[PDB]
Amino acid sequence: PQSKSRKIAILGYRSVGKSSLTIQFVEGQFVDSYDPTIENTFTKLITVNGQEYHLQLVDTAGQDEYSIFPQTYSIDINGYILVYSVTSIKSFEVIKVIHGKLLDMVIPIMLVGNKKDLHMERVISYEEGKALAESWNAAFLESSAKENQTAVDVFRRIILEAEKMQGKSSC
Amino acid sequence: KDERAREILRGFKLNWMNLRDAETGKILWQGTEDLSVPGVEHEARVPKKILKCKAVSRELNFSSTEQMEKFRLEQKVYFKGQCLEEWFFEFGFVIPNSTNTWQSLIEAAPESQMMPASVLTGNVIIETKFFDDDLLVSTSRVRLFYV
Ligand SMILES: Nc1nc2c(ncn2[C@@H]2O[C@H](COP(=O)(O)OP(=O)(O)O)[C@@H](O)[C@H]2O)c(=O)[nH]1
Ligand SMILES: *C/C=C(\C)CC/C=C(\C)CCC=C(C)C
Ligand SMILES: [Mg+2]
């Protein structure tokens, strides 16, 4: 196949940078503001090891620790990006809860510590995120939605991990 | 190995084939043309509503004078001459001088991800490679119309 279609769900607490990361990747800009309440799908082509992938990216409207896990975050998903902010302990606590609920529902998973540019506000070390990801047997990256290459790196990585392990469009 | 491949090909034929809605078993399309014959661009006209099935059951009835250890198919779907997707199916052991009905399930992509009939029709070529294990026996092509 010239272009392999994949669907990726982006999960996490409100304000961690889900929309900003996704838009930096898709549009190549740091969006001034994007409605915190809106759940939308983005479409983007990316080449990974010479293979083009056609990405359907579900930018979710964010869950907290008390949220029911939407069945629609589980159907036909090829990979999950779980995002927290390195400046928010709450967001880190919440991503652990989301992960548990995700496993209950269902798996290529990666964990992303966002806002790495905000050095004065950081409260979570790289090493703490990394240790969590290892316990999940998941990939780990830190990112800033203000830095294009770090956003691109996140989406390339989930594809890399997905390919390490069905439905036809013409039939 | 080249000689054995020719022998298998000479003794191999497709007798008939069905496409059925997997849920109901209702036949949507059937043919008796041997679409396995190499070197001819075969054509097939499939009902466009097939793209609305959640899953399709395909029946291939074939005869083989020669024994095969691991009979299998690779089907590459080309859209306007470019690789769109690939389908893989395995039958396994084939008894010499037997006739066999091979049933395969083909699941649809999510509804929002299906290619439209208007785009696909007359622009699809399925290239089928017939293998015994790693030995390429034969290759055929069929152009599809979704009507
Ligand atoms: N400095 C910085 N700010 C960010 C980053 N990502 C998001 N933001 C800001 O954090 C706020 C929430 O971001 P948003 O993408 O809407 O988060 P979402 O609720 O998870 O979709 C916005 O004001 C963004 O501009 C980042 O990597 N660095
Ligand atoms: C729903 C099924 C579609 C659209 C195509 C089914 C395949 C064929 C028709 C061609 C099969 C050809 C061989 C097995 C040689
Ligand atoms: Mg958002």
Short description:
The complex is a heterodimer of chains A (171) and B (147). Chain A has 171 residues and is an alpha/beta fold.
3D structure, described in words:
- It is classed as signaling protein,lipid binding protein.
- The complex is a heterodimer of chains A (171) and B (147).
- Chain A has one domain: 3-Layer(aba) Sandwich (Rossmann fold).
- Chain A contains 4 helices and 6 strands, in the order βαβββαβαβα.
- The longest helix of chain A has 17 residues.
- Chain B has a single domain, classed as GMP phosphodiesterase, delta subunit (Coagulation Factor XIII, Chain A, domain 1, Distorted Sandwich), CATH 2.70.50.40.
- Chain B has 2 helices and 9 strands, in the order H-E-E-E-E-E-E-E-H-E-E.
- In chain B, the strands form 2 sheets. A 5-stranded mixed sheet of chain B has the order 3-9-8-5-6. Chain B has a 4-stranded antiparallel sheet with strand order 2-1-4-7.
- The chains are: A alpha/beta (171), B mainly beta (147).
- Chains A and B meet through loops of A and strand 6 of B.
- The complex binds guanosine-5'-diphosphate (GDP), farnesyl (FAR) and magnesium ion.
Quickly give the structural class of chain A: alpha/beta
What quaternary form is this?
A: heterodimer
* CATH fold-level name of chain A: Rossmann fold
CATH architecture of chain B: Distorted Sandwich
CATH superfamily membership of chain B, which one?
GMP phosphodiesterase, delta subunit
Number of domains of chain B: 1
Class computed from helices, strands and strand pairing of chain B:
mainly beta
Protein name (chain B): Retinal rod rhodopsin-sensitive cGMP 3',5'-cyclic phosphodiesterase subunit delta
Organism (chain B): Homo sapiens (Human)
GO molecular function, one term (chain B): GTPase inhibitor activity
Keywords (chain B): Cell projection, cGMP, Ciliopathy, Cytoplasm, Cytoplasmic vesicle, Cytoskeleton, Joubert syndrome, Membrane, Sensory transduction, Vision
